[PDB]
Amino acid sequence: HLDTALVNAGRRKKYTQGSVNSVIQRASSLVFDTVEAKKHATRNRAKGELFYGRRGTLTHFSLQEAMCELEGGAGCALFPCGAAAVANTILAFVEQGDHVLMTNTAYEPSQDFCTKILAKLGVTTGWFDPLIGADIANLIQPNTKVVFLESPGSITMEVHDVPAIVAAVRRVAPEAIIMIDNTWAAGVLFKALDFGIDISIQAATKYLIGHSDGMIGTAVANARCWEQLCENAYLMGQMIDADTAYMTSRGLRTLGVRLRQHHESSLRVAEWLAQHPQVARVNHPALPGSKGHEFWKRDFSGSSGLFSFVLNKRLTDAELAAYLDNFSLFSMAYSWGGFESLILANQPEHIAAIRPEAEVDFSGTLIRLHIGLENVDDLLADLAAGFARIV
Amino acid sequence: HLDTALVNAGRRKKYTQGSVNSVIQRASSLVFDTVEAKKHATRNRAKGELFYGRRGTLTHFSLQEAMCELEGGAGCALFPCGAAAVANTILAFVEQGDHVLMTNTAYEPSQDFCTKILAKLGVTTGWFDPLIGADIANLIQPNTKVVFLESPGSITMEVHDVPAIVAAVRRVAPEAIIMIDNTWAAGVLFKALDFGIDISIQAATKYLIGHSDGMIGTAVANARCWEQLCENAYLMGQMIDADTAYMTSRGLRTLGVRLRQHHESSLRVAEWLAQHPQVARVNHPALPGSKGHEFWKRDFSGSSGLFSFVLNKRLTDAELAAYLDNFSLFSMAYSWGGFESLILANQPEHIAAIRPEAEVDFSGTLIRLHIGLENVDDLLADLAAGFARIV
Ligand SMILES: Cc1ncc(COP(=O)(O)O)c(CN[C@@H](CO)C(=O)O)c1O
Ligand SMILES: Cc1ncc(COP(=O)(O)O)c(CN[C@@H](CO)C(=O)O)c1O
Ligand SMILES: [Cl-]
Ligand SMILES: [Cl-]
Ligand SMILES: [Cl-]
Q1: Residue B72 Cα, ligand 2 centroid: separation in angstroms?
Q2: Could you state a single Gene Ontology molecular function term (chains A, B) (predicted)?
Q3: Yes or no: is domain A2-253 CATH 3.40.50.2000?
């Protein structure tokens, strides 16, 4: 039913007005025909009545309805980008004196928001290994207000045992706000809110947009946390432009077909790489043997196309150029989740430096691949040519 | 390698300037820094130097390069929609006293262009059965200038034997302009120019855009016909806006994954319908027994999602409402090639009225389906519920 839901989510007649897709309603000013209409709009300004562009237009309402349906939430807040969704969703729930507990595999700018912004405002941050499971109850403190998950982890792809983590957290601090950056799953391959997580955050920038040409963040909350998220994000003025909301709705429609091809192609690549003499490790959650693969097999309904692997060596600056500069199909860039295949290198010491209170367990250069929609045999030929350049 | 080509076609740095996709260059005025720059631009105004917005900006040049690569042509003209591409491509090659030979299964607005616009301008049109094959030779007159193909045919979906038609035309009138409306194949399931056709026309509106929210026509010509196409369409002011050009290039990137799903689901539905006791006949190019199926299998590399079937009876007006008005997932609308599934009905005499000099061979009500990206079992249940309403 997912593919049918993707095609139809948010597409009601009040938003589409006769077309297949929602109209694009560009607005700051939204006009009240009468004082009664203005009173009604004011009362319902956070409940889907047209009131002011910072609250949304029809185009936003359609995307929000669609995200709430797909992720099973009570509300969806929208942000200029994925990093803004993370920073402002955390900020919405903390005050001077609180404590945040975050996986040490979190996206680096999410860590930096904690250590460079929150700290100067009286909020502290501790760290945990992605595979801590139930032992996380040990780290929970009497002022721990937020617990921040990200699964798979950034770059290294380790999957949480979320059931064990949530259960442990609910024993010790039931009213803690559990959050997850659910971007790798595109919010649909892992139903975060069905696991007891309070808020699922996405860089819709990635698979939801799907084409590397829009930036937008989303946060879908359960009924318990929606109103605080919505009103505190709004006090920071957080919103997205109507056209980008439209393009996010539009990306949903092909998300199923795309993800199935990303899953298929990338698992094939990773199977070939795990057999490869020049490869030390392969970190693909759908690959038997990867850190947390068993949780992935159990808790996820599929895979996307982003993973990583470790070379037999820490490439020099000169080897890195010979390797990366001369691919024919993979491109060097940040971001991911689009139609084209990407390649990025992180040296083991660089990873270690973004793993607070941990070290790394590999010494080769770590290559992160986004596997796009190209023919997978073409892409293997490109990686093979890459290996020949550094042998 | 098609999937790799779809991902990469037209995406060169002079257009993308560092992003994944081409920039969107919106312009009428294009600035000449010097008289010499203006002279150079004038000389190359049809060859991809910036000259004037009506000739195109970087965004158009990128799409044009993509289409020439994917369809194997020398140039690609752009139009406001498919119907404009058809009308203006035919018009570009005719003059008073010329004769056009068009398949009697052509899209109805294409026929009306011939009978209502060309006729009063001194250009006659004759008609042929789509399975005529080599016998088209006998219809070629001394003044026949254009032979217009459409395979599969509109609504009824008959597939031409293009090799036999092209060989027969080239025996009698080697210099005739052979055109095809290649929309059903999205220009990539049937490589028209490789079969000796001179110009491949598409409503990029359909599968190239892919989301039912842009209109655009394209015409890719071989080297023999390109300059005449280019300059006579320009004399009629035909262009597309830069944003829709961008959206067409963008659609190309997912065309492969989308078409494979349309193929799989539409063939499933067609095979199910062919077994159904309320179905007299299924018109799907990929279904055994359909008209021209053998040519589809030999000459195409796949199928899209549009096809039709004939019911075992002629629906009354009351039955038509009962059937059509109460679908849950199929929607009634014109166009096709999007993510959502569509349904339309025609009575046999309506089709007969748009089959010039021919009758139809069925008497039941005809249903045209577009199979979108929804789960095919959901779509089958929607069709079954419809059959129950008219049984
Ligand atoms: C898991 C994850 N979460 C957030 C973000 C940031 O989203 P933006 O919309 O880019 O602000 C990312 C993005 N990471 C990309 C590019 O920043 C990367 O290459 O690491 C993300 O992966
Ligand atoms: C085969 C074929 N060729 C051209 C067109 C016209 O394209 P536009 O971009 O709509 O001008 C079509 C479109 N016919 C659709 C939409 O009316 C239909 O419902 O039959 C076409 O099929
Ligand atoms: Cl109130
Ligand atoms: Cl307000
Ligand atoms: Cl000119």
Answers
A1: 23
A2: metal ion binding
A3: no
DSSP conformation class of B23? P
Overall resolution, Å? 1.8
Total residues belonging to chain A: 391
A23 in B contact zone (CB under 8 Å): no
Q: Quick one: fold of A258-389?
A: Aspartate Aminotransferase, domain 1 (3.90.1150)
Please, where are the H alpha helices in chain A? 2-8, 13-16, 35-43, 58-71, 82-92, 108-112, 136-139, 162-172, 223-235, 242-252, 255-274, 293-299, 317-324, 348-353, 376-389
Alpha-carbon gap, residue A132 to B87, rounded angstroms: 67
Rounded to whole angstroms, how far apart are CA atoms B258 and B292?
24
Residue from A262, A374, A379 whose CB has the most chain B CBs within 10 Å, to mutate: A374
Residues lining ligand 2, CB < 6 A?
Answer: B 81-83, 107, 154, 181, 183, 203, 205, 215, 217, 334-336
Distance of CA A180 from the midpoint of ligand 1 (Å): 14
Q: Structural domain boundaries of chain A?
A: 2-253, 258-389
Contact A232, A219 (CB under 8 A): no
CA dihedral B10, B16, B20, B26 (to 10 degrees): -100
**Ligand positioned closest to the Cα atom of B336:** 2
Q: Kind and range of the H or E element at A76?
A: strand A75-79
A30 within 8 A of A53, measured Cβ to Cβ:
yes
Chain B residues whose beta carbon lies within 8 Å of the beta carbon of residue A7: 339-340, 372-374
Experimental approach was X-ray
Q: Using alpha carbons only, what angle is made at residue A69 by residues A67 and A72, rounded to the nearest 5 degrees?
A: 95
Give the DSSP letter of residue B273: H
- Angle (CA) A342-A385-B65 rounded to 5° is 55
Candidate from A1, A254, A374 with C-beta closest to B254: A254
Output the CA B335–ligand 2 centroid distance in Å. 6
The number of beta carbons lying within 10 Å of the beta carbon of residue A355 is 18
Chain A neighbors of B254, CB-CB under 8 A: 210, 254, 257-258, 339, 373
Across the interface, do A211 and B20 touch by the CB < 8 Å criterion?
yes
List the end-to-end C-alpha distance of chain B, in Å, as a whole number: 47
Q: How far is A297 from chain B (nearest CA, A)?
A: 23
What residues contact residue B387 under an 8 Å CB cut-off, 6+ apart?
B276, B278
CA distance A195 to A202: 17
Q: How far, CA to CA in Å, does A247 sit from each of A42, A308, B233?
A: 28, 29, 32
